[PDB]
Amino acid sequence: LHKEPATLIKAIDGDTLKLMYKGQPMTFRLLLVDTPEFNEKYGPEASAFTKKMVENAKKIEVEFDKGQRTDKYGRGLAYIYADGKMINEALVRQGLAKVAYVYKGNNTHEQLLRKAEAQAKKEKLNIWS
Template sequence: KDYTIKLLEHAKKVEAVYDVGPETDNYDRLLAYVFIDDVMLQESLLKEGLAAVRFIHKPNNTLEDEFREIQQDAEKEKLNIWSHQNYFQKDGFHPEVLK
């Protein structure tokens, strides 16, 4: 959250770009790629090990393979969420393992 806030506070331009499918999900959340000063937020978060690839559904999956590759690199480097064994699991985040 802090990383994203910092990027947004210093941004000159923020854009949302939609994939080929619906623009919202069943919960009415926007499904968009967010660009902050021409840098994709999702990609930045994955590179920094601050996010995980989850809940991508066709046809809004154009960048899924790229995102998974970026995540694998962050995992190998043990960046942020990947530096704590079992912090991120299939059912979500487990902050209790940090204690």
């Protein structure tokens, strides 16, 4: 896999954001995770977490997996990095997302994320509290 440039347009919530990619606005959905919706427990916290990471970032990158790059809603499906730190992994490590939506063929970072979730679970963080 490889990282490609993008710039932030707008934070949306814990696991979605609007980025400019190859010069075009698109909404991205984070691969392999599920944050609570804003109206759910920890939703506001997940939103804030992702917003801070992307807004503070000097460099945002998107990394597609090997499979589908757009979902049925037209959202880009990627791993998204802020100054080299993967947001998908960071949310999970903090107990602000569950590993979820693991579809065959777009699952390159599955085991990395599951290891993060185990450690969040051990620490009884947030969702796991």
